[PDB]
Amino acid sequence: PKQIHEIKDFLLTARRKDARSVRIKRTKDAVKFKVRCSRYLYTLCVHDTDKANKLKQSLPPGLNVQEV
Amino acid sequence: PSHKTFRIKQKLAKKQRQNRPIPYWIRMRTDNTIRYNAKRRHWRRTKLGF
Amino acid sequence: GSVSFVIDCTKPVEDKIMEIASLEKFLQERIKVAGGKAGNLGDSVTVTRDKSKVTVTSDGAFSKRYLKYLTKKYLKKHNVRDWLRVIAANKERNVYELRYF
Amino acid sequence: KRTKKAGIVGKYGTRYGASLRKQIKKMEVSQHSKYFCEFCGKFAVKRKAVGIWGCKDCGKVKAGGAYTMNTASAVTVRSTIRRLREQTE
Amino acid sequence: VQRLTYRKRHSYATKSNQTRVVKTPGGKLVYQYTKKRASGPKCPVTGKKIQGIPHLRPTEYKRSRLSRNRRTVNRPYGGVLSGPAVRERIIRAFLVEEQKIVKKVL
RNA sequence: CAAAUAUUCAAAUGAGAACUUUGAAGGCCGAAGAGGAGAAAGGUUCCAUGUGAACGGCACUUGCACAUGGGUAAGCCGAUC
RNA sequence: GGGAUGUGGCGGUUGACGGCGACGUUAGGAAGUCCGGAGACGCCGGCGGGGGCCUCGGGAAGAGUUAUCUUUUCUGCUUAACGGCCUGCCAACCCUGGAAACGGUUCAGCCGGAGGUAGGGUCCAGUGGCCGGAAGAGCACCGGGUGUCCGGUGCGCCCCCGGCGGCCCAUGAAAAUCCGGAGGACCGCCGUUCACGCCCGGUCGUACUCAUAACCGCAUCAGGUCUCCAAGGUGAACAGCCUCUGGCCAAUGGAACAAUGUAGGCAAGGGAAGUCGGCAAAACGGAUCCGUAACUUCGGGAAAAGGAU
Ligand SMILES: [K+]
Ligand SMILES: [K+]
Ligand SMILES: [K+]
Ligand SMILES: [K+]
Ligand SMILES: [K+]
Ligand SMILES: [K+]
Ligand SMILES: [K+]
Ligand SMILES: [K+]
Ligand SMILES: [Mg+2]
Ligand SMILES: [Mg+2]
Ligand SMILES: [Mg+2]
Ligand SMILES: [Mg+2]
Ligand SMILES: [Mg+2]
Ligand SMILES: [Mg+2]
Ligand SMILES: [Mg+2]
Ligand SMILES: [Mg+2]
Ligand SMILES: [Mg+2]
Ligand SMILES: [Mg+2]
Ligand SMILES: [Mg+2]
Ligand SMILES: [Mg+2]
Ligand SMILES: [Mg+2]
Ligand SMILES: [Mg+2]
Ligand SMILES: [Mg+2]
Ligand SMILES: [Mg+2]
Ligand SMILES: [Mg+2]
Ligand SMILES: [Mg+2]
Ligand SMILES: [Mg+2]
Ligand SMILES: [Mg+2]
Ligand SMILES: [Mg+2]
Ligand SMILES: [Mg+2]
Ligand SMILES: [Mg+2]
Ligand SMILES: [Mg+2]
Ligand SMILES: [Mg+2]
Ligand SMILES: [Mg+2]
Ligand SMILES: [Mg+2]
Ligand SMILES: [Mg+2]
Ligand SMILES: [Mg+2]
Secondary structure, rough: OEEEOOOOHHHHOOOOOOOEEEEEEEOOOOOEEEEEOOOOOEEEEEEOHHHHHHHHHHHOOEEEEOOO | OOOOHHHHHHHHHHHHHHHOOOOHHHHHOOOOOOOOOOOOOOOOOOOOOO | OOOEEEEOOOOOOOOOOOOOOHHHHHHHHOOOOOOOOOOOOOOOOOOEEEEEEEEEEEEEEEEOHHHHHHHHHHHHHOOOOOOEEEOOOOOOOEEEEEEEE | OOOOOOOOHHHHOOOOOOOHHHHHHHHHHOOOOOOOOOOOOOOOOOEEEOOOOEEEOOOOEEEEEOOOOHHHHHHHHHHHHHHHHHHHH | OOOOOOOOOOOOOEEEEEEEEEEEOOEEEEEEEEOOOOOOOOOOOOEEEOOOOOOOOOHHHHHOOOHHHHHHHOOOOOOOHHHHHHHHHHHHHHHHHHHHHHHHHO
């Protein structure tokens, strides 16, 4: 497993062809976005409520999205 | 042991099949003299030296 | 700050098993504060009453597990420990309550 | 102090005889001594094995005596070899 | 106190069977098998450690398993000779070569 | 039929209980153990269900016995090099 | 690990940059030939570090005791490989500088004009920290919900590591495998040990016992048979004795206490008179203080002996 820091790098990874699904995990602190790729699971931590929503709406329409 | 050669396991399988009672219908045959297996082995007695 | 722990005895009195006045009185006589003598009733710890719940409050540090120890002792002293148990309230973590088995 | 005559040989206790302990004393002392390194100029040469003498700091290793760095005949042999080499010329 | 067992069929405390105790998220203790301590690269002329390279088992240095910066040092005789050894060889190579010319002239 | 401290009570099951099962109590091993796992060696003794006799040097409803079935999954543990 | 294949990146001063330097950065030519390292190694003794365990306290959850006392006793309160960043022990190395009125320094050592102390750095390893994995799991409670937290200590125990010292007429494997290097023949739209991406991974073993009943001793035989883990108290202590986890009451049962046995004790007064013979038993015993002869190979004798607590 690997962590992603900036939002844009998560955007390109979720747009990868080998990306299969995105899991959204809600914690009491932040919101974790996990995209399952071929070799690694990439996790990005969003500490902002609206940035989580903007990320949710701006995801690629072709990728599956799951709520955890 | 747990660590077995294949050739030892194959022989152990045959010896497992061979120690069964004789079928009951064998005793009903026309000229039958067989009573029991005469070759049953129990593991605690009569070890097979492999 | 002002630490407050409250024992909720709502059910036991609606079924007339014990009396919260005896519970409150048991608490004022058997509380040691700041490592002093038992039931000294200093200026810090105070015990107040309601119709159903007894409230303990102090300006120093008070351990909630001490209140549970004193409540269970009171239940044995008045022969209700078999029928009642002290349970932390799901809603609030500064609150106990008495529940039937 | 701790002993009037035994010294290093007191590790052997009362065993093996007084004459044998006195015999082994000189070689026990000499084989555990620190010798001068001609290459670097320090008293850092220690016996690594019988005949092998290594300096701690400069790292030179030298073939020498069994229990002393230079045997007496080694000096005599070197002088004979040196005189033969010069007189050869 | 949660005594432990070996997890494979090696029953003897050999150097290749060394274990460590770890706590799992299951709240228990299990054995994990470790790797034997290995020397790193060594210098043949000084005997000292070669700086800049980790101390691993030989097959953990494999190219597919280790990055190139970790494997090498950027200097002639990089992972083979230390800096002091390389300085001495350069100076010896040049100074003896000058002596060869002086021998030729004289 | 006497080494290795030791059993007791109530209930259940069963033709039959000092010896099976459950609960309670009293004790022992005392962690270089009478605990938990392996290498040799064994080879089905492992698990379930059932029980004529024999066997378990007293007994048994019970089993390391007997009968009928079931059970051992690897690119990473090993062999293999 | 192997095999195919792109997309992106990287280099062409043909074969990259940075750093005084130690060295750093995910990439960043190359054939025959040659060179080095790792693998790769004994025993003993201190010291230091990390992990686990034990142990003291606080908080919260549940349970035990409760005539009296007990802010109490008990249980649990967890975090894997793998990846990134940080840290950077003890050694080792680098740069500046130039030391006697010598200094630095260990439990011990030992170190310094062949460059110390000092100042500033590089690397090394970790079973170290944080994040991802990962709370969604596991556990404990309450009826879906709550919580999964904060400290302290050490000649403690087990494992591993580090770094010193000692010892030898004893110096304590090899090979497969992997990495690095020297050289530079040869070569330009061709090179690429980089990232991401695609496919594949054979055969045989695997149950169970490992022993006062699964092995050998003709047996379900008080014998014999190689290992790992290992808690609390007392105590110097893996001694003995008691306890927790876990495991067991399987060793035919009942009645009664004759002789003689077997195993274990005591016995007034005497104290080896017993017997081939003090055989057997009894006496002594830990720790602290005092004190300790002849003889001696000068090392011992010695815990001599003898007293006190
Ligand atoms: K390097
Ligand atoms: K295999
Ligand atoms: K070896
Ligand atoms: K691993
Ligand atoms: K298995
Ligand atoms: K046995
Ligand atoms: K008798
Ligand atoms: K006598
Ligand atoms: Mg047998
Ligand atoms: Mg035969
Ligand atoms: Mg007898
Ligand atoms: Mg019995
Ligand atoms: Mg005992
Ligand atoms: Mg006991
Ligand atoms: Mg078992
Ligand atoms: Mg069975
Ligand atoms: Mg019988
Ligand atoms: Mg059978
Ligand atoms: Mg393997
Ligand atoms: Mg010694
Ligand atoms: Mg300094
Ligand atoms: Mg995490
Ligand atoms: Mg949970
Ligand atoms: Mg041990
Ligand atoms: Mg080259
Ligand atoms: Mg042990
Ligand atoms: Mg003690
Ligand atoms: Mg003990
Ligand atoms: Mg018997
Ligand atoms: Mg009897
Ligand atoms: Mg007498
Ligand atoms: Mg007398
Ligand atoms: Mg006499
Ligand atoms: Mg006589
Ligand atoms: Mg006589
Ligand atoms: Mg005697
Ligand atoms: Mg004497």
